[PDB]
Amino acid sequence: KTISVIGMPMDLGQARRGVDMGPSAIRYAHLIERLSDMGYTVEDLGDIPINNLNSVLAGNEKLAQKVNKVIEEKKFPLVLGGDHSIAIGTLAGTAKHYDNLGVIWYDAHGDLNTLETSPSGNIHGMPLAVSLGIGHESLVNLEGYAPKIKPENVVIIGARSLDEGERKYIKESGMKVYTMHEIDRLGMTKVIEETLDYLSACDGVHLSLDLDGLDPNDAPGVGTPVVGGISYRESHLAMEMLYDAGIITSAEFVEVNPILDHKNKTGKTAVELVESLLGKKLL
Numbered sequence: 001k002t003i004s005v006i007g008m009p010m011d012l013g014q015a016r017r018g019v020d021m022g023p024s025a026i027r028y029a030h031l032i033e034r035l036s037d038m039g040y041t042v043e044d045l046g047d048i049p050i051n052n053l054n055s056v057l058a059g060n061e062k063l064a065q066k067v068n069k070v071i072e073e074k075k076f077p078l079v080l081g082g083d084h085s086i087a088i089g090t091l092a093g094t095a096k097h098y099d100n101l102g103v104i105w106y107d108a109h110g111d112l113n114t115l116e117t118s119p120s121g122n123i124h125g126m127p128l129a130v131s132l133g134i135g136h137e138s139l140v141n142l143e144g145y146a147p148k149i150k151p152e153n154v155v156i157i158g159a160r161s162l163d164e165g166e167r168k169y170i171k172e173s174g175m176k177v178y179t180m181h182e183i184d185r186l187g188m189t190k191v192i193e194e195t196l197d198y199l200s201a202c203d204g205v206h207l208s209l210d211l212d213g214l215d216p217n218d219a220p221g222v223g224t225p226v227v228g229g230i231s232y233r234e235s236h237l238a239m240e241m242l243y244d245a246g247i248i249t250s251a252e253f254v255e256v257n258p259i260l261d262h263k264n265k266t267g268k269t270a271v272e273l274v275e276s277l278l279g280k281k282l283l
């Protein structure tokens with residue numbers, strides 16, 4: 001598989017400055033050369049330019065176009081970007097190519113909000129509710145079809161800041177979510193194995209990884225850290241098991257904010273996880 005990297009320096013889905021530099025902070029940390037050293041022929045398609053609502057719309061519209069074309073040549077889009085609102089454009093570009101796309105949402109949050117239920121209106125807390133598809137029309141109907149995905153095809157892994165209307169929708173919708181409780185109880189191995197089997201009926205699986213899914217001690221450079229998260233090791237285990245399964249057909253790594261990071265510790269971790277996702281082995 002030929003890795004197509006697509007930078008999305010999007011910060012307009014959130015109020016904190018700096019997450020638009022995530023792509024550069026990951027590129028630095030040697031994403032390309034590490035993937036080339038692994039045997040992949042990787043093409044870096046650069047960053048999508050950005051100039052709330054409309055700029056979120058236009059930018060995601062352009063992101064969806066590139067991801068769509070990438071999959072058209074059957075290459076594997078690796079987005080990497082700014083705030084999680086870019087998943088709207090990413091999933092809009094991949095879902096149409098799969099009769100039954102699965103989604104692994106690696107995140108401390110559910111991002112299942114809506115501008116009415118949102119206490120901030122920050123769209124990086126809506127991309128999964130959008131896309132499912134409940135939310136602002138122009139957002140839900142991105143790329144002219146909706147919903148992009150089915151709640152029964154989503155598995156959230158890492159939830160620990162999910163209060164209020166999000167929880168109600170989870171149980172009413174039938175999403176499978178592994179909160180920190182299930183990870184602590186069953187261990188990450190079982191969680192992934194149950195995730196794989198659960199998603200075994202999908203034509204493809206998109207990995208949407210929010211770096212704040214990891215504990216802030218391991219991923220401090222995020223805009224909305226939440227204590228008691230997934231460890232660096234557990235995260236590598238999950239990536240390694242996902243690779244061995246061969247189910248992941250697209251991936252995005254979001255919310256890296258160098259302005260809140262410690263010497264690009266979070267950007268480095270992001271590259272390290274991509275390596276494991278794309279087949280890097282200790283032995």
Ligand SMILES: [Mn+2]
Pocket residue numbers: 084107109111124210
């Ligand atoms: Mn998120």
Ligand SMILES: [Mn+2]
Pocket residue numbers: 107108109210212213224
């Ligand atoms: Mn999050």
